GROMACS .gro file of C-alpha atoms in nm:
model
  391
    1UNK     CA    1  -0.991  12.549  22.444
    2UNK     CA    2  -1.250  12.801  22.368
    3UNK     CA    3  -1.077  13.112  22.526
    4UNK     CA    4  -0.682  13.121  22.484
    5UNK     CA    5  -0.459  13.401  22.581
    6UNK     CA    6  -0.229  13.579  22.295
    7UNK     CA    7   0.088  13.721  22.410
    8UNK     CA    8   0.178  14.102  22.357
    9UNK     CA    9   0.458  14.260  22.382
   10UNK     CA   10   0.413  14.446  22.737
   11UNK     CA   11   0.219  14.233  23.029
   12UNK     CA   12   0.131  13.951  22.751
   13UNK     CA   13  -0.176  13.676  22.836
   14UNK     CA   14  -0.434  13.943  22.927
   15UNK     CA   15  -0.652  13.949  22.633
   16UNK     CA   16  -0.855  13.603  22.503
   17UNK     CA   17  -1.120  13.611  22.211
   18UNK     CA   18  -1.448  13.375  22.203
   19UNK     CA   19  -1.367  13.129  21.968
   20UNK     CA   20  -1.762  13.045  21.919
   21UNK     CA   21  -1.810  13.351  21.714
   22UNK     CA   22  -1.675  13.337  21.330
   23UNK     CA   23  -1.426  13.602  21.254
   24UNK     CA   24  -1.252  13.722  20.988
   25UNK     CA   25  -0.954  13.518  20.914
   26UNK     CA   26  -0.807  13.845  20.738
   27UNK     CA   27  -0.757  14.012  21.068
   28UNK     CA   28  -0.565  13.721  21.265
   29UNK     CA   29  -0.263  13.739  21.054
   30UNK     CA   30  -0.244  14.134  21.147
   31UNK     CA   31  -0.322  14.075  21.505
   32UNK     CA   32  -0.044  13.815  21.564
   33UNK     CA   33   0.206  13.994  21.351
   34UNK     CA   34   0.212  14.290  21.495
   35UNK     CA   35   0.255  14.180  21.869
   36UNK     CA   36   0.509  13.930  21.772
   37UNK     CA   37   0.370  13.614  21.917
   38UNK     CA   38   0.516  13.293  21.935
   39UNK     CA   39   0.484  13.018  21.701
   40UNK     CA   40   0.295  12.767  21.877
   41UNK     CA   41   0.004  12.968  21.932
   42UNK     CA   42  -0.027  12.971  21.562
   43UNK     CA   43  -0.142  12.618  21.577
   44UNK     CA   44  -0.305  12.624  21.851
   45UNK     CA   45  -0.579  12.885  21.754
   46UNK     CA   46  -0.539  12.628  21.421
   47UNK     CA   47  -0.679  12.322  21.580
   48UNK     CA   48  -0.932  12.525  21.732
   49UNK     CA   49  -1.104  12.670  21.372
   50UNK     CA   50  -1.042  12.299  21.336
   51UNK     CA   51  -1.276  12.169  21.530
   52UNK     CA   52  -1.584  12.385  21.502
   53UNK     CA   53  -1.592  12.158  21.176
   54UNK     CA   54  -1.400  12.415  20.935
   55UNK     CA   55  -1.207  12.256  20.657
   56UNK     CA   56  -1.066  12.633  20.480
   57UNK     CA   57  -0.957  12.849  20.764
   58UNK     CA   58  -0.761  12.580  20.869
   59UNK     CA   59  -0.586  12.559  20.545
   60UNK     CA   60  -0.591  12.942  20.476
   61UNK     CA   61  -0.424  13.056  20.837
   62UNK     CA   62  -0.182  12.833  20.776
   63UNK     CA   63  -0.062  12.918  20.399
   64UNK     CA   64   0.046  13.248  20.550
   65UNK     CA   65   0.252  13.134  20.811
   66UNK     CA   66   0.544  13.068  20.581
   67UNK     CA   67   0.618  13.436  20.560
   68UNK     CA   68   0.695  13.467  20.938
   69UNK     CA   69   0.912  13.130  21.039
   70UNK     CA   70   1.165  13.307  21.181
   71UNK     CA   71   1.213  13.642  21.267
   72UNK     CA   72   1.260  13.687  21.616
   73UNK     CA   73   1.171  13.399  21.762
   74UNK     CA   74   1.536  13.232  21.888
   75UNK     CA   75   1.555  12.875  21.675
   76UNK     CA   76   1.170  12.844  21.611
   77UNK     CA   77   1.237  12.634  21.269
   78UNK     CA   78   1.059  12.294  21.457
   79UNK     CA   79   0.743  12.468  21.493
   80UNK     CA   80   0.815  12.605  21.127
   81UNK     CA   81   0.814  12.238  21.022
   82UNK     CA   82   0.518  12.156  21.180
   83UNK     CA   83   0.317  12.439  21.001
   84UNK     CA   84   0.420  12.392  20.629
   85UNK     CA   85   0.345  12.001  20.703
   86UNK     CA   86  -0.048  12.050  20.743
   87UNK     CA   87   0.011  12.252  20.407
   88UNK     CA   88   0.187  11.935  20.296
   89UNK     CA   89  -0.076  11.660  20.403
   90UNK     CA   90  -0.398  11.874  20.429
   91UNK     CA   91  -0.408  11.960  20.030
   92UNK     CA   92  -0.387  11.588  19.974
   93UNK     CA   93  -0.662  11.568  20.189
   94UNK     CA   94  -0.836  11.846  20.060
   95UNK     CA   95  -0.831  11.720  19.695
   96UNK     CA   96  -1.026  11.407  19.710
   97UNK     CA   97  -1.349  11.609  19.802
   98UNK     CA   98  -1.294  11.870  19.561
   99UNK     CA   99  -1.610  12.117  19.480
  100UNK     CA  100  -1.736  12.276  19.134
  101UNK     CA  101  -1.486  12.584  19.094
  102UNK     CA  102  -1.179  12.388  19.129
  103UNK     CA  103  -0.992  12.095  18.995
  104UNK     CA  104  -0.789  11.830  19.094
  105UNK     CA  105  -0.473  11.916  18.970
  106UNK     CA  106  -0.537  12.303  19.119
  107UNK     CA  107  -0.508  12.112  19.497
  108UNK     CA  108  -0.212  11.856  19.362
  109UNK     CA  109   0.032  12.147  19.202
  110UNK     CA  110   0.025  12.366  19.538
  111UNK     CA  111   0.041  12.006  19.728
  112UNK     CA  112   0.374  11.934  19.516
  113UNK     CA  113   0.542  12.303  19.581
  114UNK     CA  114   0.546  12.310  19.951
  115UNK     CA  115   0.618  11.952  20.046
  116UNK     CA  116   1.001  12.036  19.910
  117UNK     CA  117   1.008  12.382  20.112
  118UNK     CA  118   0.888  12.168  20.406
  119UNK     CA  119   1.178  11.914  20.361
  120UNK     CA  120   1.422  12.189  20.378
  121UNK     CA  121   1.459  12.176  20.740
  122UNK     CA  122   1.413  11.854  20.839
  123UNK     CA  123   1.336  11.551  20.572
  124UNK     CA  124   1.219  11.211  20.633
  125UNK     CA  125   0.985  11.293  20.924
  126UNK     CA  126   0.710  11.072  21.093
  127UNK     CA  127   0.492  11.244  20.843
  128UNK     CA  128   0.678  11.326  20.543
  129UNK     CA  129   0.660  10.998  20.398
  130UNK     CA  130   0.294  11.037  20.431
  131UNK     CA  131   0.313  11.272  20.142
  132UNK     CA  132   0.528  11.088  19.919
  133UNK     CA  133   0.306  10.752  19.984
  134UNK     CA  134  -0.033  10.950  19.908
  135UNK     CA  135   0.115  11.161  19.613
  136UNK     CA  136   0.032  10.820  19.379
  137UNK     CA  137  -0.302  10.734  19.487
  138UNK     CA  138  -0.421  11.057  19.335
  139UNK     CA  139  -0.260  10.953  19.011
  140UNK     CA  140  -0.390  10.600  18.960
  141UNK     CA  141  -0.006  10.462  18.933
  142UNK     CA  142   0.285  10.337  19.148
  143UNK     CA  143   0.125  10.124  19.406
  144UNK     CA  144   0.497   9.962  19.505
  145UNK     CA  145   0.617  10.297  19.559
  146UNK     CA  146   0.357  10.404  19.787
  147UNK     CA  147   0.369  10.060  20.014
  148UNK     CA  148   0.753  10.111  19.999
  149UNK     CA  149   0.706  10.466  20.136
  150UNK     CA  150   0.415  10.376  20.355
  151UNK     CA  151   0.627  10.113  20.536
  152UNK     CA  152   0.924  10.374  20.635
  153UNK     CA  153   0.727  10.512  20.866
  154UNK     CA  154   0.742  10.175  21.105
  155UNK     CA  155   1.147  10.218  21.084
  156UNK     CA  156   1.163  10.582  21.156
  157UNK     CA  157   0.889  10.623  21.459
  158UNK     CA  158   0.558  10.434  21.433
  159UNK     CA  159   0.385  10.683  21.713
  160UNK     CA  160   0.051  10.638  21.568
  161UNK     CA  161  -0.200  10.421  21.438
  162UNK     CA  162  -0.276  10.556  21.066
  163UNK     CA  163   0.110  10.579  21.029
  164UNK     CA  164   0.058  10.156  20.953
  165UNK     CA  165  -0.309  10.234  20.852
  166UNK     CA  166  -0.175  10.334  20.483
  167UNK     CA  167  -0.020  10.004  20.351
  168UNK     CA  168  -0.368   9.840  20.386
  169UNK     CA  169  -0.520  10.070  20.136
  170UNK     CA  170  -0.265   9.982  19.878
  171UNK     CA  171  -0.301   9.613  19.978
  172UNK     CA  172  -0.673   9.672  19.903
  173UNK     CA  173  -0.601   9.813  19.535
  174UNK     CA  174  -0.361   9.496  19.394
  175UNK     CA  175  -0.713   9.279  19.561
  176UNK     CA  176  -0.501   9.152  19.867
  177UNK     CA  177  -0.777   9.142  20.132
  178UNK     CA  178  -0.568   8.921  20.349
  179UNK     CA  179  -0.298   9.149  20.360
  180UNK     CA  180  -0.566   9.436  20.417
  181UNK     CA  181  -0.773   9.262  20.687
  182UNK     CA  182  -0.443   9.225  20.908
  183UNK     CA  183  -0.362   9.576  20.902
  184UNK     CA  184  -0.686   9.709  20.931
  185UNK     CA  185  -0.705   9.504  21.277
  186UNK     CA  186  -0.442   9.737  21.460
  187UNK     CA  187  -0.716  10.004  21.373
  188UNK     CA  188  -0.934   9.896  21.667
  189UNK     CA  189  -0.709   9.810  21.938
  190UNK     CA  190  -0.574  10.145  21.974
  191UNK     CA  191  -0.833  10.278  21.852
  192UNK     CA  192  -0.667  10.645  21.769
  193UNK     CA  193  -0.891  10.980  21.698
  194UNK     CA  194  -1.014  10.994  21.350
  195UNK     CA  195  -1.375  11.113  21.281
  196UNK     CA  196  -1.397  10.926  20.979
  197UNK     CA  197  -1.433  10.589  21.214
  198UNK     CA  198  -1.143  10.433  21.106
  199UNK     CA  199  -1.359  10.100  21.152
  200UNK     CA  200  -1.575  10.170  20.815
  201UNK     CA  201  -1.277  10.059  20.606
  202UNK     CA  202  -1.239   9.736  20.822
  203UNK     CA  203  -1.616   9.665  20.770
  204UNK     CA  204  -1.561   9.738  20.394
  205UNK     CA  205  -1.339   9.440  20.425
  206UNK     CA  206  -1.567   9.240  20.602
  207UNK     CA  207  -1.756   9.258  20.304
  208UNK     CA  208  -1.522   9.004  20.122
  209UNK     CA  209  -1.446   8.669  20.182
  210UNK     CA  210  -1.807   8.554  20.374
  211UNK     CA  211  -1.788   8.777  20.662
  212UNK     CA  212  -2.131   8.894  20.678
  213UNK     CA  213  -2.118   8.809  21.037
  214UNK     CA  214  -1.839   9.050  21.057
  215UNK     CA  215  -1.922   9.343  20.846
  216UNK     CA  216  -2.222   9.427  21.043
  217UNK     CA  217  -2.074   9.434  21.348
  218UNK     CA  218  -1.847   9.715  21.219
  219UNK     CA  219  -2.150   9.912  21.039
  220UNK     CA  220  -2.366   9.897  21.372
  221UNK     CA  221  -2.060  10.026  21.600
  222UNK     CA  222  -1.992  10.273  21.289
  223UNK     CA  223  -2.346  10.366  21.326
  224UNK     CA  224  -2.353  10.461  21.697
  225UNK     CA  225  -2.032  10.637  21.782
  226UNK     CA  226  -2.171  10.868  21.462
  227UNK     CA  227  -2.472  10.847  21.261
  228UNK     CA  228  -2.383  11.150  21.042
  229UNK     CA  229  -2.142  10.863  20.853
  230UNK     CA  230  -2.377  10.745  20.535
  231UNK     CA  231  -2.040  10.498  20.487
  232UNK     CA  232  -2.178  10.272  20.735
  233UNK     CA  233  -2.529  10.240  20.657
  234UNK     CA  234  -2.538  10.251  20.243
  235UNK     CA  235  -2.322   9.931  20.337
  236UNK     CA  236  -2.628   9.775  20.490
  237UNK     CA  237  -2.801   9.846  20.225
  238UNK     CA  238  -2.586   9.673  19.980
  239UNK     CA  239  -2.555   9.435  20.258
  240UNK     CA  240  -2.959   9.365  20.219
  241UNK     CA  241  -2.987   9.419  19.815
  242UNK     CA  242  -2.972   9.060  19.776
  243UNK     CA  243  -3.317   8.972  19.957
  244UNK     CA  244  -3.587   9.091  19.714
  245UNK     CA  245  -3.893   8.912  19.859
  246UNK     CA  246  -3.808   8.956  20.248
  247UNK     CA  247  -3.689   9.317  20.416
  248UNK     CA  248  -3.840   9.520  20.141
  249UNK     CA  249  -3.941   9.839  20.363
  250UNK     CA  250  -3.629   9.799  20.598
  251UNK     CA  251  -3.414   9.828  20.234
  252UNK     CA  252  -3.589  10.127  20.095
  253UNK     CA  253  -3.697  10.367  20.327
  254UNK     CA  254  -3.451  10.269  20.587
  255UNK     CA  255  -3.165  10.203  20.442
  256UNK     CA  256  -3.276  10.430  20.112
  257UNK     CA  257  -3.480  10.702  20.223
  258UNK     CA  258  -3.288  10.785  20.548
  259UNK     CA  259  -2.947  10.779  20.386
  260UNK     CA  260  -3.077  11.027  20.128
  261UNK     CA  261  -3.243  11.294  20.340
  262UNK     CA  262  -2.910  11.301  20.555
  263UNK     CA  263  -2.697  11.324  20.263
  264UNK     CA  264  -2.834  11.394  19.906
  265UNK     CA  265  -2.525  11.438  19.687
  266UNK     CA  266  -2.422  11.062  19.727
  267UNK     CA  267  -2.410  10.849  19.369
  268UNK     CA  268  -2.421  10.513  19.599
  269UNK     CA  269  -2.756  10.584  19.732
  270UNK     CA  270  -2.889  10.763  19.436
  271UNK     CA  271  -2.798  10.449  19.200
  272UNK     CA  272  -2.999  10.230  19.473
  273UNK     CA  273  -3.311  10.442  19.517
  274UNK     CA  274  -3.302  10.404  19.102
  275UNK     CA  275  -3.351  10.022  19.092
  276UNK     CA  276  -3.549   9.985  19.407
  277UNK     CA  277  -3.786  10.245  19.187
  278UNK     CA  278  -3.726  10.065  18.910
  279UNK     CA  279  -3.954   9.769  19.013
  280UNK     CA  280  -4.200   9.957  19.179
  281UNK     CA  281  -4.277  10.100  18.766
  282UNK     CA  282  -4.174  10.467  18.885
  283UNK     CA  283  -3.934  10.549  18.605
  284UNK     CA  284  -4.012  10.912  18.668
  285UNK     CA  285  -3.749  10.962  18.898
  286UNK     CA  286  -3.509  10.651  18.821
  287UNK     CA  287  -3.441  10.938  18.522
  288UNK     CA  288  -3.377  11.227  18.766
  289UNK     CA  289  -3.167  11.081  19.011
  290UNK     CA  290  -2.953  10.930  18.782
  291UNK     CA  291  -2.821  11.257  18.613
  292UNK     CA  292  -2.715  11.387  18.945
  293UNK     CA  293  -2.570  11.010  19.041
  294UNK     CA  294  -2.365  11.067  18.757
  295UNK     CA  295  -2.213  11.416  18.705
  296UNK     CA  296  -2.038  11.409  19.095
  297UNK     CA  297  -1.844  11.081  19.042
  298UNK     CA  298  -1.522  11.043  18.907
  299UNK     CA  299  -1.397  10.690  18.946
  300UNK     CA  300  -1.571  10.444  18.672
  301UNK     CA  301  -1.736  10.229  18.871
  302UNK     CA  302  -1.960  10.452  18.957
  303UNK     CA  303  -2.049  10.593  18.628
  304UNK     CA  304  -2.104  10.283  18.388
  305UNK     CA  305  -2.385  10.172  18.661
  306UNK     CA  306  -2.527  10.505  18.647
  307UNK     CA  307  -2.573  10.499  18.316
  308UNK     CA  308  -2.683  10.178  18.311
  309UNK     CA  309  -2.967  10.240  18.458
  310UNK     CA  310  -3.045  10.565  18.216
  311UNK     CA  311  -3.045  10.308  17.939
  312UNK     CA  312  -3.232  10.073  18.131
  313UNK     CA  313  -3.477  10.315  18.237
  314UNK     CA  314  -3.514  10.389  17.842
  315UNK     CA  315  -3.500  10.016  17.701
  316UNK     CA  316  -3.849   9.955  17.866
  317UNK     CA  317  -4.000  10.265  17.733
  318UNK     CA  318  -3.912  10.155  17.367
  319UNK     CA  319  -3.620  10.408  17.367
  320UNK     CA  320  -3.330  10.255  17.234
  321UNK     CA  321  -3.167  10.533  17.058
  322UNK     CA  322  -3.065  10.695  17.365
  323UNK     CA  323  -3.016  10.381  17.561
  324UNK     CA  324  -2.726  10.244  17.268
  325UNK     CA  325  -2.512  10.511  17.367
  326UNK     CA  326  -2.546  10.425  17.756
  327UNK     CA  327  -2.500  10.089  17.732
  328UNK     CA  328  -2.218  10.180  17.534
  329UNK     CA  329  -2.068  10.401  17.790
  330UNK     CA  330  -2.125  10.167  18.107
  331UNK     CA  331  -1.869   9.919  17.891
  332UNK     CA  332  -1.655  10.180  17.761
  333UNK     CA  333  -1.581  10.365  18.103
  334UNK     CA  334  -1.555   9.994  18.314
  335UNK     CA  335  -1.595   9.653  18.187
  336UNK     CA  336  -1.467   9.422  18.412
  337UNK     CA  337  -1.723   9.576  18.695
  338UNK     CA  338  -1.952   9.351  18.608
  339UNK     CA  339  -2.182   9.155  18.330
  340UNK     CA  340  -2.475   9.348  18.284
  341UNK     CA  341  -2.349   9.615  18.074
  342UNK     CA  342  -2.236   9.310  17.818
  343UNK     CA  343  -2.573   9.209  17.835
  344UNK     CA  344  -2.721   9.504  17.747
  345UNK     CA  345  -2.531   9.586  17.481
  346UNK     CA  346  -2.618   9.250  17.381
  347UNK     CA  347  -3.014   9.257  17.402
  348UNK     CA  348  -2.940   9.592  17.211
  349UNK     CA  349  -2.750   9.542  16.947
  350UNK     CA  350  -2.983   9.380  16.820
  351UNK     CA  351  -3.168   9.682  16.719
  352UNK     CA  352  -3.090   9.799  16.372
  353UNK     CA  353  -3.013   9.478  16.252
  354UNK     CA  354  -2.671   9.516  16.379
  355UNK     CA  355  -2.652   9.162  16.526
  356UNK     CA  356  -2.340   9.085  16.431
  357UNK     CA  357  -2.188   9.300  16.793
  358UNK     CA  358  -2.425   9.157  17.002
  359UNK     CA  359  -2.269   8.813  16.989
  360UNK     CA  360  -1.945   8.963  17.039
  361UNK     CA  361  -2.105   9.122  17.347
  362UNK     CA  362  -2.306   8.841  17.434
  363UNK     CA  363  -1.948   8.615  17.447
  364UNK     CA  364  -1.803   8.784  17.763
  365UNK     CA  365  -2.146   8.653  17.935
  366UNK     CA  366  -2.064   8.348  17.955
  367UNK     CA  367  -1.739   8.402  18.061
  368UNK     CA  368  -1.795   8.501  18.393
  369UNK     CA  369  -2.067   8.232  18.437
  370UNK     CA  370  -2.411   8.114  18.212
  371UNK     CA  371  -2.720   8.215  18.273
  372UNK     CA  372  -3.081   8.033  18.152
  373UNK     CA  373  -3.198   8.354  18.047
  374UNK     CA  374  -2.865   8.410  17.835
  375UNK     CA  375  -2.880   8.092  17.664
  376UNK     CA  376  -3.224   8.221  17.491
  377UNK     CA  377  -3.067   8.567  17.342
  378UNK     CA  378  -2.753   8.394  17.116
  379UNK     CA  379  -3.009   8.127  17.023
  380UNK     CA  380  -3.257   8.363  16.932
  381UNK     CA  381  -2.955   8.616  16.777
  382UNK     CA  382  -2.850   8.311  16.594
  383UNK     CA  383  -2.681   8.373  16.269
  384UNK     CA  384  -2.631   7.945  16.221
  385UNK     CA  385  -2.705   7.881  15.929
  386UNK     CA  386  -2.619   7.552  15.808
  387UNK     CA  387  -2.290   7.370  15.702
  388UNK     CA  388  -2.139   7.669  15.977
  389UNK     CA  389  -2.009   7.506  16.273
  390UNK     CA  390  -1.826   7.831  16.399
  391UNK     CA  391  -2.190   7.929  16.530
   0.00000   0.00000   0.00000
């Protein structure tokens, strides 16, 4: 709990340490190696660094435990297991929110040693196949593998909730929401511990398919079990984009300014506070916000509507130069996201007399769906001439 015993070697379970002080975590691999001390309260003074909300100790006391499995013990290799598997599922875990000194492959190659040194002993566990699965999300690739791997885990011992939880996420990624919304239903009955409220993903699927009745009655329960989550309320926001003459102070200083004081390094909100401050004719800070929107995200959805609105931002203020190059880069890094980058690079190709590109760009409008205001800007970038029926 807060004060466990640690066995010594004559009259042990006299001595507990305050676990609401930080220590050193130098000190405890000394102080239970020299007193020999069983396995298991390894990790149990794990899960308590845990959860005082401490992402590294947890990983660091446990990367040292590899060096004493066995050596008196009796037959301790289960609880040997059990340790190398947090250092075989945690650095998965630990790689998606990477920080500014490390990379992603410096979490993946010591997430790729130790899963095969934890296999040693005993393979093909209720979390094992955990690893595989998740080893090809990181990559981009393999999504049959994963949902093969994923679904091993119902034939071997399905004792949990998230051990079904991960075939939704690759239903998600080949755009199967019906396969997604079934799973993600078993997520609520049960309801198992998970402080990332396992119900955000199941409003995130709300989202689709005309469930707006739906998806905010996930966000609102999301919202008070935990309102340090941003996940459920920058939903509402995106939820309430749509309505541009009705709920304007409800959309940017509730749903803007409140998800931005509680959590400031987030692209989502950054990106939203830029075009709701892009109408108000406050380009001062569209400009600022934008840069850090942009240099935290990886994926490239993210990214092309960041710089988007840099060019954006710069197409109003007669500053096309360095607005080219953006709207170059939101179609460049992702194009099918959606069709204002083509447009832009269609109203601005026509800078420099280089015309000729922005009916190429100006094509893929139409594609998705006219617009009146599109019809205007190949008429007006006509290059018809006469006896030319191609144009």
């Amino acid at each position: 709990r807060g004060s466990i015993e640690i066995p010594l070697r004559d009259t042990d379970e006299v001595i507990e340490l305050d676990f609401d002080q930080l220590p050193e975590g130098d000190e405890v691999i000394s102080i239970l190696k020299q007193e020999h001390t069983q396995l298991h309260i390894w990790i149990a003074l794990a899960l308590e660094y845990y959860k005082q909300g401490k992402t590294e100790e947890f990983v660091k006391l446990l990367e040292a435990a590899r060096i004493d499995g066995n050596l008196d013990y009796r037959d301790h290799e289960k609880d040997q297991m059990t340790c190398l598997d947090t250092l075989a599922a945690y650095y998965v875990q630990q790689a998606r929110k990477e920080k500014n000194k490390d990379n992603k492959k410096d979490l993946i190659t010591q997430a790729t040693l130790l899963y095969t040194m934890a296999d040693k002993i005993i393979m093909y566990d209720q979390n094992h196949l955990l690893g595989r699965a998740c080893f090809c999300l990181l990559e981009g690739d393999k999504m049959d593998q994963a949902d093969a791997q994923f679904h091993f885990v119902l034939n071997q011992s399905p004792n949990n909730i998230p051990a079904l939880l991960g075939k939704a996420c690759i239903s998600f990624n080949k755009k199967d929401y019906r396969g997604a919304l079934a799973y993600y239903k078993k997520a609520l009955r049960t309801n198992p511990g998970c402080p990332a409220e396992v119900r955000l993903g199941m409003g995130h699927c709300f989202v689709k398919l005309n469930k707006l009745e739906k998806a905010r009655l996930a966000f609102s329960r999301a919202l008070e079990l935990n309102s340090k989550c941003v996940g459920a309320l920058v939903g509402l926001a995106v939820l309430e984009l749509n309505n541009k003459e009705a709920d304007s102070i409800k959309n940017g200083v509730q749903l803007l300014s409140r998800a931005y004081t509680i959590d400031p390094s987030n692209p989502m909100v950054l990106n939203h506070l830029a075009n709701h401050f892009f109408f108000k004719k406050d380009y001062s800070k569209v400009q600022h916000l934008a840069l850090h929107a942009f240099h935290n995200t990886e994926v490239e959805a993210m990214q092309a509507e960041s710089c988007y609105q840099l060019a954006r931002s710069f197409h109003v203020q007669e500053d096309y130069d360095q607005a080219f190059q953006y709207y170059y880069q939101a179609t460049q890094f992702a194009s099918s996201s959606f069709v204002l980058p083509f447009f832009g690079l269609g109203q601005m190709y026509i800078y420099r007399g280089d015309k000729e590109n922005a009916s190429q760009c100006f094509e893929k409008v139409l594609k998705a769906y006219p617009n009146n205001y599109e019809t205007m800007k190949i008429l007006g970038s006509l290059y018809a001439a006469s006896e030319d029926q191609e144009k």
